[PDB]
Amino acid sequence: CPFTGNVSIRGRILRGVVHSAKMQRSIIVRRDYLHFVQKYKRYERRHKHVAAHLSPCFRVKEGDIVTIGECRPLSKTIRFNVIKVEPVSEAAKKRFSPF
Amino acid sequence: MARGVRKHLKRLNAPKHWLLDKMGGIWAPRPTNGPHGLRECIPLILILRNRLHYANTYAETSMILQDKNVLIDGKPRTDPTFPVGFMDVFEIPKVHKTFRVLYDVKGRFTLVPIQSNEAGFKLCRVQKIFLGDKGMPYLSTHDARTIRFPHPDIKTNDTIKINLKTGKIDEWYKFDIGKIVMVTGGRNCGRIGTIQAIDKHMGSYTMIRMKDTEGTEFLTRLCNVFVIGNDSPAVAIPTTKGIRPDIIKNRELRLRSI
Amino acid sequence: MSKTSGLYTARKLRTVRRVNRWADKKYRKAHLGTWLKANPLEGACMARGIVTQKIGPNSAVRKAVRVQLTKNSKKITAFVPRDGSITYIDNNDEVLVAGFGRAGRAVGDIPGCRFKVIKVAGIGLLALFLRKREKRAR
Amino acid sequence: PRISRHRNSSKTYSTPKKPFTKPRLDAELKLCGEYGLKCKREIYRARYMLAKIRRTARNLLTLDENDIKRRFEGAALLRRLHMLGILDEEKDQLDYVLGLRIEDIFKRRLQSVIVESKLAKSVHHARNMIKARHISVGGQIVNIPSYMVRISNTSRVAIADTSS
Amino acid sequence: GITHDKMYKRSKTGAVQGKWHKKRKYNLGRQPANTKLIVNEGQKISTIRCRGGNIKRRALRLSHGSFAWGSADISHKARILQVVYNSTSNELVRTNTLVKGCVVQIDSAPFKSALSNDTLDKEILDQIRGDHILARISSRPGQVGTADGYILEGPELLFYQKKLAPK
RNA sequence: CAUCCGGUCGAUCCUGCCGGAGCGCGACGCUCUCCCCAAGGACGAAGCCAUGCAUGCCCGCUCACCGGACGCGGCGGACGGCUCAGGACAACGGUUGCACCCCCCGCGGCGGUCCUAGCCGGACACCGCUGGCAACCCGGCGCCAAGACGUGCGCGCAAGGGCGGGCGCCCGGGCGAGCAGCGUGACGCAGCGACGGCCCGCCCGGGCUUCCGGGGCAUCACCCGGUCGGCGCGGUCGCGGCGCGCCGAGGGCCCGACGCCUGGCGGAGAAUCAGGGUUCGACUCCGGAGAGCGGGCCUGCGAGACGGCCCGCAC
RNA sequence: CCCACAGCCCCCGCCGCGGAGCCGAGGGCAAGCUGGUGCCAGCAGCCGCGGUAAUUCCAGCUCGGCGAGCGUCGCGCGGCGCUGCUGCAGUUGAAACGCCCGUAGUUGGCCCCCCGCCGCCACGAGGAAACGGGAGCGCUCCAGGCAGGCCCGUUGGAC
RNA sequence: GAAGGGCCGCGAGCCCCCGCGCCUGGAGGAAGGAGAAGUCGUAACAAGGUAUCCGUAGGUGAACCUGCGGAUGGAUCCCU
Ligand SMILES: [Mg+2]
Ligand SMILES: [Mg+2]
Ligand SMILES: [Mg+2]
Ligand SMILES: [Mg+2]
Ligand SMILES: [Mg+2]
Ligand SMILES: [Mg+2]
Ligand SMILES: [Mg+2]
Ligand SMILES: [Mg+2]
Ligand SMILES: [Mg+2]
Ligand SMILES: [Mg+2]
Ligand SMILES: [Mg+2]
Ligand SMILES: [Mg+2]
Ligand SMILES: [Mg+2]
């Protein structure tokens, strides 16, 4: 945990939405961005999956918005820890949300 | 991956501001570790052969140096590849030539002839304060120099005056708005101006806004801003007052010179 | 209208072009890989081989030869154009064989011939038909 | 590697996309006759140079008059053209540049200035004299027929002081 | 030899990557020390030449260490009798193998020689009047060649007593 | 630097292909007066190798011979040069971080060491006598040198470990960020020292790491099982399923996973030419990988090195 | 003179070798006279010629193109608006699924005068050169190179 | 502190089995294309001498014929 543990937040701060929360103390965050193709002068919508450690100090469900901070390697695929999370409603048509 | 450090340096890969001819050869001098880094320095041989022209080849420079005919910060140096940096002291008593190494407007090294009144000290930038063994405070400078037991009033980014004979601080100029500075990094190397504003972004760089003497304004990060006095330079500087002309004026000047 | 034109539709355009550009016969023949394997010349300008037999609306019989490529061991026919050059080629003589103007396809009224003979025993056919050089060594 | 690998190099001429075209053949022959040209690579070089000038003029003309790049590049181009003498002194607008032709380029050749000074009986005579080294451009003898003479040296092209 | 380079693993999707270089000397490991409690034979410590000329000492056999009583601020050198609990595995306890986190039994002589005459924690006194005291190992044998630690007290002591009581 | 022409018919207009016309890269044929610049065994054989050469230098140690030999010792040989086999969320390109790291030379500082000091002890080399074997290789005895080896005079000092802050948050040694240092209770005597340097900072370099980009086939649609996470120890310069024990179940996928193929090193760039783009990118500069195939290791700050050693296989 | 030694460029005196080939002549495509052979031999990238004037084969004359270079073979770009984002076609030439529902995906009427966020535009920092563009300099010109002159911006090598 | 030995760790080579990819022999069978001036008939183009074509099913030396339903690209834009 970043508040009660012995790890520090350093580097880049990002935002995303919760994709899965089946793990013990971890989640999967989905990030939306845009890619530009010069030939056709148009964009494409892409997505990536990013894993984070969720401290017991937060209650999170799917579709919530989270802020993650970079830290040292915590595992094979984990380098981020949650620091904030806004709530959302269960009923809400999924919307492509770059952040 | 090379199994060890690098001891060579291709001429085509050398820094642009050294002004080395493409056809001079495949190789170029490799500076050795010392007061200044590779990209913030220039070798002695280049000054002594490609500028002052007192030597025509590597061998002549070797003999001149090993005979102890050059002094650096009051200390004779015999390495042709010894790195020369910023705000250094160059002395050749045989011909009574004293120079301080500064930056021109175009962004290249130059020699500023000086007098005997101010060649006993140099200006250095402080960028690190830390506790050493036993907890005794220290500090470091842009020329790889350490001083023990500094005054608490001195903080980071400041500027320090130290005698060449003795590394004892005489006076320190603070880092504050309204002070003349000299840029030493990037697109604006060599420009002289006064500070106007300071804006900090947490966790990242700090940007400085300065205004030239003629009203021109420009920006840069705090890692390449050097203080040279309080409202007036403490040292003698080149003929021009740190004014970068436009392309039109430079072309006119070239035409006049031709 | 017919084609996609939205501002976020470059992926579909790229995929459509990738799929549809395989319909061209030339692009297929050049980028598919079948021809390169099936071509006895394997993309070479010309080949060195060994002749093994001489044979020959227009009703004129054209003179050619059967050859086996040294590096390939498959059989083909190459046609000797210049007059009087049949006698200049002898059975079991090393030759260098190139192609006609139309890559792959037959050229002219000749059925089942797609190559040319340009050297025998190391002498250019043109240099010999004009009497510049001579084949006294063979 | 050897230092010889860093020596730059490029071609200097172009060939017409349609070779067999009667009017072009006749015009090229006529220009050779009035200028005594050896082969047709010289006309190609001239067209190359003219194309470069025209392209630069176009690019500068698309831009605004008060564009700093426009001022700089146009001033340099005008200075070069005037010093060469290809463009008249009284013209100082980039628009006039587009109306230049290869003939103006030919008129500043060494043979041209030699002949219009009446120093030679003809273009062929001028060329043969140039080969034998009887001419002192400025103060220096030159044996290149295609050497171009600037305005400041046109009054100074003389006979070699060493020639018989 | 032994290594911890990640080229030989799988991707997050469980796919094989493929090897593009031979083994490198930065990514190497070494056989575990397996420090044994003594209970020719004696305190045996070896040394290892590590990267950059550094020296790392690992212990193979030892029997004494420094231990502390934080509440009473008492610290002496004692003998470790045996290991009695280890979360990782029971095999280590049977073999008496020393590692960080192992709960050991020390002798009471150096402590009882000055205790039992001052008001303090009751349980520590009960251990003192006996022949052994529960303690823990805080150092890393195999990296520094020493076995130091501190005496238990509070909820963790209750936890370990409740754990090892039925045995 | 915005170009077209001939061919289906008894004649005509279209669609549509075929062929011509230019540039560059190479190979072949013919021919060739003079000067300048200049590539050159890469093209599914990373196939095989006679012959010769490609890394030495010197400050210390002279009863060697008439000081030059030689050898001990020090520095360097991990740079440079050749190639593109392998490898397709990798490498590589731009952008972050180490509050998870190591670092020779050089520069500047600092320099207090627990319990015969007008200067300690023994060896080996070369070398003399004596010898083995085809060659390569070395043996035995013998006096002698060190800025070599060993011990070591000396003002307490390496590594590690325990205790030492707050009362909703914020408002100096240093930070954006409770990070460094110190005191104190116990362990242990590491390093320097027979002409004094352990130690610290900077520099070059290296290791990993955030974000974005990063070949084709769906006649490959479901894949992974240390694979996904947690706890604990070990090992590592060091973080980490890196390895082990226990627990839970997880992770990726038509925004194309996984599998297969590639006559696949990448980039800066090259060719072509209205504008938009297509194809190539062995090779000059940067980075990566290798030295017949596959593995292992010593020395060293630094190599899993091959003009270093050991093994198996093929020659 | 230069060169580590030699060449070589260039300067100086004496004697003085002047040499063009490769393709083609029906159209595309600029360029025509006799003798042979007779659907044979051969030419021909395509159309085509040759079965007695052969304007196309084999020779002579003549003529045209480029030029110390010319022609042939294979590949890439262009030709090509025959891969079409700019910018193809879909009644009859090749091509609208037999029809409906429908998820991912793509696309979504109008309105609030100033707040926050994403995209967007402009400027700026920072970060390698060579190549490319480009200012100036008469290597005799040039391909090039960063020189060079005297009383040189601090001579210059900007961007 | 040498040789030597034992347990584990790295890991070559050989053997056994399985799978993937690329080539390849084959009696006989069957398709296509080209060549010639072959034999058997006439299915289509005119109402082509039974209007043509589509889907389906069966039969027949061969082209093809017939039945069920559909189209006009027909030989009809026209009749309480
Ligand atoms: Mg002591
Ligand atoms: Mg000693
Ligand atoms: Mg390969
Ligand atoms: Mg390289
Ligand atoms: Mg290697
Ligand atoms: Mg090796
Ligand atoms: Mg070798
Ligand atoms: Mg080597
Ligand atoms: Mg149709
Ligand atoms: Mg009929
Ligand atoms: Mg009928
Ligand atoms: Mg009909
Ligand atoms: Mg039809």
The DSSP-derived string for B221-248 is EGGGEEE-BSSSBSS---SS-S----HH
Q: Which domain holds residue B33?
A: 2-117
Report CA(A94)–C1'(G34) in Å, whole number.
94
Please tell me the distance from the alpha carbon of residue B173 to that of residue B179, in angstroms, as a whole number: 9
Distance (angstroms) between ligand 4 centre and the Cα of B25 equals 18
* B42 falls within a domain: yes
Q: State whether B27 and B85 are in the same domain.
A: yes
* B250 falls within a domain: no
Chain C residues with beta carbon closer than 8 angstroms to that of A39? 10
The DSSP-derived string for B110-158 is EEEE--SSSTTEEEEEEEEEEE-GGG-EEEEETTS-B-SS--TT--TT-
* B100 falls within a domain: yes
Report residue E132 as tokens.
């052994």
Q: State whether B76 and B139 are in the same domain.
A: no
Tell me which protein residue sits closest to nucleotide F213, measuring alpha carbon to C1': A35
End-to-end CA distance of chain E: 42
Please tell me the distance from the alpha carbon of residue B226 to that of residue D128, in angstroms, as a whole number: 68
- Angle, in degrees to the nearest 10, between helices D41-62 and D68-84: 150
Strand ordering across the sheet containing E132-137: E64-69, E74-85, E103-107, E132-137, E149-151
| C-beta separation of C63 from C89 below 8 A | no
Return phi, psi of residue B145, to 5°. Answer: -135, 140
Tell me which protein residue sits closest to nucleotide F241, measuring alpha carbon to C1': A76
Which of C102, C58, C100, C104 lies closest to C81, judged by CA?
A: C100
Q: For E111, which DSSP code?
A: H
Please tell me the distance from the alpha carbon of residue A32 to that of residue A16, in angstroms, as a whole number: 8
Please tell me the total count of domains within chain B.
Answer: 3
Mark yes or no for CB contact A43/C10 under 8 Å.
yes
- From C5, which residue of chain A is nearest by alpha-carbon distance? A42
DSSP bridge partners of B130: B138
Rounded to 5°, the CA angle B67-B72-B78 comes to 30
Return phi, psi of residue B184, to 5°. Answer: -140, 20
- From C6, which residue of chain A is nearest by alpha-carbon distance? A42
| C-beta separation of E102 from E90 below 8 A | no
* Residue A60 half-sphere exposure toward CB, CA atoms < 13 A: 32
- Angle, in degrees to the nearest 10, between helices B247-257 and D68-84: 20
Q: For B4, which DSSP code?
A: S
Nucleotides of G under 7 A from a protein CB: 12, 23, 29-30, 39-46, 48-51, 57-58, 65-68, 72-76, 82-86, 88-90, 96, 105-108, 117-120, 124-132, 134-138, 140-147, 152-159
Please tell me the distance from the alpha carbon of residue B39 to that of residue B17, in angstroms, as a whole number: 10
Report residue E161 as tokens.
């007593």
| C-beta separation of B64 from B70 below 8 A | yes
* B257 falls within a domain: no
Residue E151, SS3 per DSSP: strand
Report CA(C50)–C1'(H24) in Å, whole number.
25
* D160 falls within a domain: yes
Q: Which of B88, B117, B146 is the last residue of a domain?
A: B117
Q: Which residue has the tokens 């250019």?
A: C124
Q: State whether B71 and B157 are in the same domain.
A: no
Chain B residues with beta carbon closer than 8 angstroms to that of D71? 248
- Chain C touches chain D, with at least 3 Cβ pairs below 8 Å, answer no
In chain A, after which residues is the C-to-N distance over 2.5 Å, breaking the chain? none
Sign of CA dihedral E139, E141, E143, E148: positive
Which of B75, B83, B114, B65 lies closest to B18, judged by CA?
A: B83
Give the neighbours of chain A: at least 3 Cβ pairs within 8 Å.
C
Q: Return the H-helix or E-strand segment holding E82.
A: strand E74-85
| C-beta separation of B69 from B92 below 8 A | yes
Which residues 69-128 of D interface with strand G at a CB distance below 7 A? 72-73, 76-77, 79-80
The experimental method, as deposited, was: cryo-EM
Burial of B202 (0-12, 13-18, 19+ CB in 10 A): exposed
Please tell me the distance from the alpha carbon of residue C80 to that of residue C85, in angstroms, as a whole number: 7
CA of B26 vs chain D CAs: smallest distance (Å) = 7
The alpha carbon of residue B160 and the mean position of all alpha carbons in its chain are separated, in whole angstroms, by 14
* B25 falls within a domain: yes
Q: How far, in Å, are A63, B11, C119 from residue B52 at the CA level?
A: 71, 21, 67
- Considering all nucleic acid strands, name the nucleotide whose C1' atom is nearest to the C-alpha of residue C126: F29
* D10 falls within a domain: no
DSSP bridge partners of C94: C50
Q: Return the H-helix or E-strand segment holding B39.
A: none
Please tell me the distance from the alpha carbon of residue A49 to that of residue A23, in angstroms, as a whole number: 15
DSSP bridge partners of A48: A31
Q: For C22, which DSSP code?
A: G
**Residues contacting residue E130 through CB under 8 Å, at least 6 positions apart:** E108
Q: State whether B127 and B112 are in the same domain.
A: no
Q: Which of B84, B101, B117 is the last residue of a domain?
A: B117
* B239 falls within a domain: yes
Residue B3, SS3 per DSSP: coil
CA of C36 vs chain A CAs: smallest distance (Å) = 31
Please tell me the distance from the alpha carbon of residue C11 to that of residue C5, in angstroms, as a whole number: 12
Mark yes or no for CB contact B248/D71 under 8 Å.
yes
The alpha carbon of residue D42 and the mean position of all alpha carbons in its chain are separated, in whole angstroms, by 10
Q: State whether B168 and B179 are in the same domain.
A: no
The alpha carbon of residue D76 and the mean position of all alpha carbons in its chain are separated, in whole angstroms, by 17
- From C11, which residue of chain A is nearest by alpha-carbon distance? A44
Q: How far, in Å, are D111, D113, D117, D152 from residue D149 at the CA level?
A: 10, 8, 13, 8
The DSSP-derived string for A28-61 is EEEEEEEEEETTTTEEEEEEEEEEEE--TT----
Q: Which domain holds residue D106?
A: 19-164
Q: What is the 3-state secondary structure (H, E, C) of chain D?
A: CCHHHHCCCCCCCCCCCCCCCHHHHHHHHHHHHHHCCCCCHHHHHHHHHHHHHHHHHHHHHHCCCCCHHHHHHHHHHHHHHHHHCCCCCCCCCHHHHHHCCHHHHHHCEHHHHHHHCCCCCCHHHHHHHHHHCCEEECCEECCCCCCECCHHHHCCCEECCCCC
* B252 falls within a domain: no
**Checking DSSP bridges between strand C123-124 and strand B159-163, what pairing results, if any?**
unpaired
Longest dimension (CA), chain E: 70
Mark yes or no for CB contact B12/D6 under 8 Å.
yes
Please tell me the distance from the alpha carbon of residue B73 to that of residue B61, in angstroms, as a whole number: 19
C124 touches strand G (CB under 7 A): no
Please tell me the distance from the alpha carbon of residue D122 to that of residue D143, in angstroms, as a whole number: 17
Please tell me the distance from the alpha carbon of residue A60 to that of residue A76, in angstroms, as a whole number: 23
Resolution attained, angstroms: 3.1
Residue C135, SS3 per DSSP: coil
**Residues contacting residue A37 through CB under 8 Å, at least 6 positions apart:** A43, A44, C10, C14
Which of B82, B96, B171, B191 lies closest to B126, judged by CA?
A: B171
Distance (angstroms) between ligand 12 centre and the Cα of B133 equals 111
Burial of C1 (0-12, 13-18, 19+ CB in 10 A): exposed
Residue B65, SS3 per DSSP: helix
- Chain E touches chain C, with at least 3 Cβ pairs below 8 Å, answer no
Q: State whether B148 and B103 are in the same domain.
A: no
Return phi, psi of residue C26, to 5°. Answer: -65, -50
Please tell me the total count of domains within chain D.
Answer: 1
Chain A interface, best mutation among C3, C4, C11, C16, by max A CB count within 10 A:
C11
* D96 falls within a domain: yes
Please tell me the distance from the alpha carbon of residue C71 to that of residue C60, in angstroms, as a whole number: 33
The alpha carbon of residue C131 and the mean position of all alpha carbons in its chain are separated, in whole angstroms, by 27
Mark yes or no for CB contact A43/C13 under 8 Å.
no
Report residue E112 as tokens.
């009882």
Please tell me the distance from the alpha carbon of residue C8 to that of residue B249, in angstroms, as a whole number: 48
Report residue A36 as tokens.
């530009």
The alpha carbon of residue B197 and the mean position of all alpha carbons in its chain are separated, in whole angstroms, by 24
Which residues 23-62 of C are in CB contact (within 8 Å) with A? none
The alpha carbon of residue B3 and the mean position of all alpha carbons in its chain are separated, in whole angstroms, by 33
Please tell me the distance from the alpha carbon of residue A68 to that of residue A15, in angstroms, as a whole number: 6
Please tell me the distance from the alpha carbon of residue B22 to that of residue B69, in angstroms, as a whole number: 30
- Considering all nucleic acid strands, name the nucleotide whose C1' atom is nearest to the C-alpha of residue E1: H10
Mark yes or no for CB contact C14/A45 under 8 Å.
no
- Angle, in degrees to the nearest 10, between helices D22-35 and D41-62: 100
Q: For B166, which DSSP code?
A: S
Establish if A33 touches chain C: CB-CB under 8 angstroms.
no
Q: State whether B107 and B12 are in the same domain.
A: yes
Report residue A48 as tokens.
């990536």
- From B11, which residue of chain D is nearest by alpha-carbon distance? D3
Report residue B79 as tokens.
């390495």
Distance (angstroms) between ligand 11 centre and the Cα of E63 equals 115
Chain B interface, best mutation among D5, D6, D66, D82, by max B CB count within 10 A:
D6
Please tell me the distance from the alpha carbon of residue D75 to that of residue B255, in angstroms, as a whole number: 12
Q: Which residue has the tokens 């002589």?
A: E109
Please tell me the distance from the alpha carbon of residue B32 to that of residue B36, in angstroms, as a whole number: 9
Q: Count H helices, E strands: chain B?
A: 3, 16
Q: State whether B203 and B151 are in the same domain.
A: no
End-to-end CA distance of chain D: 50
Which of B86, B74, B67 lies closest to B190, judged by CA?
A: B86
Report residue B214 as tokens.
């003629």
Which residues 4-23 of C are in CB contact (within 8 Å) with A? 6-11, 13-14
- CB nearest B23 (choices: D3, D68, D72): D3
Chain A residues with beta carbon closer than 8 angstroms to that of C8? 42-45
Count the neighbouring beta carbons within 10 Å of the beta carbon of residue E111.
22
Which of E116, E117, E138 lies closest to E129, judged by CA?
A: E116
Distance (angstroms) between ligand 13 centre and the Cα of A55 equals 72
- From A45, which residue of chain C is nearest by alpha-carbon distance? C8
| C-beta separation of D147 from D135 below 8 A | no
| C-beta separation of B170 from B185 below 8 A | no
Establish if A93 touches chain C: CB-CB under 8 angstroms.
no
Return phi, psi of residue C51, to 5°. Answer: -75, 155
Number of Cβ pairs < 8 A linking chain A and chain C: 20
| C-beta separation of B117 from B98 below 8 A | no
**Residues contacting residue B125 through CB under 8 Å, at least 6 positions apart:** B141, B142, B157, B158, B159, B160, B226, B227
Tell me which protein residue sits closest to nucleotide H11, measuring alpha carbon to C1': E1
In our burial notation (b when 16+ CB lie closer than 10 A, e otherwise), range D19-48 reads eeeeeeeeeeeebbeebbbeebebbbbbbe
Return phi, psi of residue B210, to 5°. Answer: -130, 155
* D68 falls within a domain: yes
Mark yes or no for CB contact A40/C13 under 8 Å.
yes
Q: How far, in Å, are C130, D138, E26, E55, E56 from residue E52 at the CA level?
A: 79, 72, 11, 9, 11
Please tell me the distance from the alpha carbon of residue C62 to that of residue E20, in angstroms, as a whole number: 57
Give the neighbours of chain D: at least 3 Cβ pairs within 8 Å.
B
End-to-end CA distance of chain A: 24
